[PDB]
Design an enzyme around this catalytic site. Sequence first.
Site, PDB file in Angstrom:
ATOM      1  N   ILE A  45       9.586  -1.008  -9.261  1.00 29.47           N
ATOM      2  CA  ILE A  45       8.533  -1.482 -10.131  1.00 29.47           C
ATOM      3  C   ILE A  45       7.281  -0.605  -9.971  1.00 29.47           C
ATOM      4  O   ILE A  45       6.688  -0.554  -8.887  1.00 29.47           O
ATOM      5  CB  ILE A  45       8.153  -2.926  -9.753  1.00 29.47           C
ATOM      6  N   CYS A  46       6.877   0.078 -11.037  1.00 29.85           N
ATOM      7  CA  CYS A  46       5.593   0.760 -11.031  1.00 29.85           C
ATOM      8  C   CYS A  46       4.448  -0.233 -11.336  1.00 29.85           C
ATOM      9  O   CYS A  46       4.202  -0.592 -12.499  1.00 29.85           O
ATOM     10  CB  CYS A  46       5.567   1.892 -12.043  1.00 29.85           C
ATOM     11  N   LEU A  47       3.778  -0.686 -10.281  1.00 28.77           N
ATOM     12  CA  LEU A  47       2.754  -1.723 -10.391  1.00 28.77           C
ATOM     13  C   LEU A  47       1.613  -1.336  -9.489  1.00 28.77           C
ATOM     14  O   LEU A  47       1.860  -1.033  -8.301  1.00 28.77           O
ATOM     15  CB  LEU A  47       3.346  -3.056  -9.916  1.00 28.77           C
TER      16      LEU A  47
ATOM     17  N   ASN B 215       8.253   0.220 -17.003  1.00 28.83           N
ATOM     18  CA  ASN B 215       7.737   0.379 -15.625  1.00 28.83           C
ATOM     19  C   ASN B 215       8.730  -0.063 -14.526  1.00 28.83           C
ATOM     20  O   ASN B 215       8.345  -0.259 -13.393  1.00 28.83           O
ATOM     21  CB  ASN B 215       6.441  -0.419 -15.521  1.00 28.83           C
TER      22      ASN B 215
END
Length: 148
Positions: free
Chosen positions: A86-88, A79
Amino acid sequence: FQGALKRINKELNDLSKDPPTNCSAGPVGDDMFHWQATIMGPEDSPYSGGVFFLNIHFPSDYPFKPPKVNFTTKIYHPNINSQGAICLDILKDQWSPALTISKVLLSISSLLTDPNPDDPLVPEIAHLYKSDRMRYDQTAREWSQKYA
């Protein structure tokens, strides 16, 4: 937002009064909208013992828009990509102005322990995570050692 600085100040004081575990962050220079953060790799993860730096930019519209958070330390995680993006969820559609940079840092630390292979920024890493998890784990260890 005429009130963003007051909120970044409130948050600076509370990351100081009650800091997130294995995390730190604060302003860099006379630019309050620019923070940096350090996250220690969680022990129950292949990032254990690694020391990760992050760059933070609060939008002019903060807290109505989430902070832009990028890893500056290279890291092997499904991620998180080459540019440190950041894929969050809480940095995207699940942002609320009631969240804080502390909560953001703790969710990043949780993300290191528990990646989300189904919402990847790096397809190859995500696939390896799901299909040969110890290969991914060993590489995450190698990268933590080399770069962190």
